[PDB]
Each structure stands twice: as C-alpha cells, then as structure tokens.
Amino acid sequence: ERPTFYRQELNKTIWEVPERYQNLSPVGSGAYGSVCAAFDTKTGLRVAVKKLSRPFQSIIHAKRTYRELRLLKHMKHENVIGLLDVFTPARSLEEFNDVYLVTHLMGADLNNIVKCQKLTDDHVQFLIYQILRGLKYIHSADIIHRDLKPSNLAVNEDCELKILDFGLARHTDDEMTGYVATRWYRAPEIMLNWMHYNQTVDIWSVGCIMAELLTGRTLFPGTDHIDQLKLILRLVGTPGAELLKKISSESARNYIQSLTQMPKMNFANVFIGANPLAVDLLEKMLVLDSDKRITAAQALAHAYFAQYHDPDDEPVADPYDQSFESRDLLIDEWKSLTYDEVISFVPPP
Numbered sequence: 033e034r035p036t037f038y039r040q041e042l043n044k045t046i047w048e049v050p051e052r053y054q055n056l057s058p059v060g061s062g063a064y065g066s067v068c069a070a071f072d073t074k075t076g077l078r079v080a081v082k083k084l085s086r087p088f089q090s091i092i093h094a095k096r097t098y099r100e101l102r103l104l105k106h107m108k109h110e111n112v113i114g115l116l117d118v119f120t121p122a123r124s125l126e127e128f129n130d131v132y133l134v135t136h137l138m139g140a141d142l143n144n145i146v147k148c149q150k151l152t153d154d155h156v157q158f159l160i161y162q163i164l165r166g167l168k169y170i171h172s173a174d175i176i177h178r179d180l181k182p183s184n185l186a187v188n189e190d191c192e193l194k195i196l197d198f199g200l201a202r203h204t205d206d207e208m209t210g211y212v213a214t215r216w217y218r219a220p221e222i223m224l225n226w227m228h229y230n231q232t233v234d235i236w237s238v239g240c241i242m243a244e245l246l247t248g249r250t251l252f253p254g255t256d257h258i259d260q261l262k263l264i265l266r267l268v269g270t271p272g273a274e275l276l277k278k279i280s281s282e283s284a285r286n287y288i289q290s291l292t293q294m295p296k297m298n299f300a301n302v303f304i305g306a307n308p309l310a311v312d313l314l315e316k317m318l319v320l321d322s323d324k325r326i327t328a329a330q331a332l333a334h335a336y337f338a339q340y341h342d343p344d345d346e347p348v349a350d351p352y353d354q355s356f357e358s359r360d361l362l363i364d365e366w367k368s369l370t371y372d373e374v375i376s377f378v379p380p381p
C-alpha cells in the first residue's frame with residue numbers, strides 16, 4: 033500500500049518522501065553523501081535519510097546503487113548499520129529514478145568522540161569490543177569494509193556503536209593524497225597495492241583506531257603514502273623474507289627492499305601507561321603480514337574484552353550471495369534488479 037509522499041527542496045534538489053518522515057535536516061556536512069536527519073513519526077525513531085545521487089546515470093553508478101541496497105538489506109546486527117526503510121516516489125519501473133535509504137541516526141561519529149571526550153580504558157574496551165563484534169558479523173558474510181575509520185563509526189549517548197560504509201570501497205587518488213585521515217587507517221598492503229588483499233585489512237584499521245582511543249593521537253599520521261609507510265615500519269619493523277615473497281607487486285617489493293632494515297619496536301614503550309592487555313592486543317592486530325593478524329572472532333575472545341565477551345551473543349551473518357559482483361549487466365538491468373529489491377523490502381520488527 034503506497035504511502036502519500038510530500039516534496040521539499042533540500043541539498044539543492046527536490047526530496048520527495050513519505051509523510052511519516054518529518055523535520056528533514058541536512059547532516060554530515062557532505063561527508064556521508066546526501067543525508068538528512070529526520071523524525072520517523074511511525075516508529076518514534078530519529079533516522080538518517082540518504083537520497084542517492086543520480087543512481088542510474090552509468091553502469092558504474094547503477095551497479096553501486098544495487099550494491100549499496102543489497103548490502104543494507106542483508107545486514108541485521110546491533111553493531112552494523114542496517115536498513116529501516118527504502119523508498120521511491122516512482123509508481124512503476126519506467127518512472128523509477130531515485131532511491132532513498134533510511135537507517136538509524138546516531139548522535140555522533142567516533143571522530144567527534146575521541147576529539148571531545150576523555151576515554152577511559154573501559155570506554156576503549158566497550159567501543160573496540162563493539163567494532164570487532166560488528167566486524168565478525170560483516171567478515172562472516174565475506175564482506176570487507178576496506179575503509180574503516182573513526183568517521184564511519186556512528187555512536188549514541190550510551191557509547192553504543194554501529195559500523196557504516198562497509199563494502200562500498202571508493203576514493204580518488206587526490207582524496208588519498210597528503211596529510212589526510214582518509215589514508216591513516218589503511219593497511220599498508222592496500223595503501224601500496226602489495227597484493228590481492230582480503231578482510232584482514234580491516235583488523236589493521238581497528239589497531240589504528242584502538243591506539244588512537246588509548247592515546248588520543250593518530251597512530252600513523254603520514255604526510256603522504258611514503259611518509260606513512262615509514263611511520264608504520266618504524267613501529268612494526270620492516271618486512272622479513274616470508275612477507276616479501278608474498279608481495280606480488282614486483283615494483284612494490286623492489287622499493288620496500290631499498291629501505292634500511294628496522295626491528296619491531298617495544299609496544300609497552302610506545303604505549304606508556306596502557307593496560308598490558310590492550311598492548312598485547314595491539315601487537316596482535318598491528319602485524320605487517322596480513323596472514324598473521326588476529327581475526328575479529330579471535331580478538332573477541334582476547335582477555336582485554338573479558339568484561340564484554342559473550343560467545344552466545346556474537347552472531348554471524350546469513351549467507352550473502354554476491355555473485356552479482358562478477359556480473360556485467362546493462363544500466364537498465366542493474367536498475368531492474370534494484371527496483372525488485374526496493375519493492376520486496378520488508379521492514380524490521
């Protein structure tokens with residue numbers, strides 16, 4: 033049964049949304065795309081409404097629209113952003129051309145938390161616990177976040193946390209250039225394209241985030257890719273023979289071999305005053321060889337989280353069929369698939 037929709041101008045375009053959503057107000061300062069906060073009068077929830085920009089203008093846009101909708105429809109986990117609603121004012125596939133995604137709105141991101149608050153060790157435990165609990169779920173569906181950073185960890189007043197923006201990858205070279213947070217949380221294998229990477233890139237990012245909650249300071253605030261790699265290698269040491277062999281980029285291998293060999297530093301001296309259990313977990317996360325990093329499931333059982341860990345309440349995801357990713361389709365075929373997903377949406381309980 034079709035809701036009645038109303039129109040207003042927001043973010044220099046016409047937003048057309050069901051009446052249940054009231055007091056739309058732009059948020060994010062552009063960062064999360066075209067997102068408005070709203071009040072969902074039907075549920076009493078503060079919601080975030082994302083209007084997809086030009087979702088079917090190219091094959092690339094059409095496929096990424098389908099991708100985002102597929103991802104959100106799948107994720108049903110307390111620590112992972114999920115889909116409250118998805119709609120279009122279109123009454124048929126022919127007229128279908130805008131997609132609006134509705135999620136919970138959290139009051140802040142972690143970037144603002146670590147900037148404006150003092151985090152106790154207990155706050156760090158709880159926050160990192162929740163990130164790993166959400167990542168266990170994401171990783172179990174064979175989704176890689178690839179871009180985990182403080183600004184995509186959404187947090188309410190009770191420090192309850194949801195992970196945003198997983199599996200969408202993105203980013204231009206210019207965006208990754210220079211003294212920029214966009215690059216500081218990236219695993220070096222993906223920063224320098226050493227090899228075909230996998231979900232283990234996300235654990236590096238968690239290590240960088242955790243260290244920063246502990247010290248209040250960016251762990252590897254490189255001024256550029258090369259300066260960042262040097263900051264990283266000073267802390268964790270230069271690669272050994274075994275890791276070198278795994279760098280399939282011959283070019284990248286050759287460069288990294290030009291560097292003066294350095295040993296791994298003592299993490300107790302780097303993280304003075306930190307809980308020894310935090311120091312140990314950092315050591316297990318910040319391993320240069322991605323093969324040897326602790327996994328999210330393993331990390332949840334680490335002694336640092338003894339107060340939060342519950343093995344009966346760390347769920348995994350239902351199978352996520354992402355065979356569409358291998359598929360070459362036309363714009364109108366991606367658009368039809370997206371429409372089927374809009375039409376079949378059933379809201380959460």
Ligand SMILES: Cc1ccc(C(=O)NC2CC2)cc1-c1ccc(C(=O)NCC2CC2)cc1
Nearest residue numbers: 064080082135137138140141186196197198
């Ligand atoms: C609305 C929306 C739609 C999609 C996605 C997403 O992650 N998609 C990728 C597929 C996973 C995210 C959102 C969204 C959810 C929450 C906030 C929020 O609370 N921001 C932090 C506070 C402002 C300080 C912003 C955007």
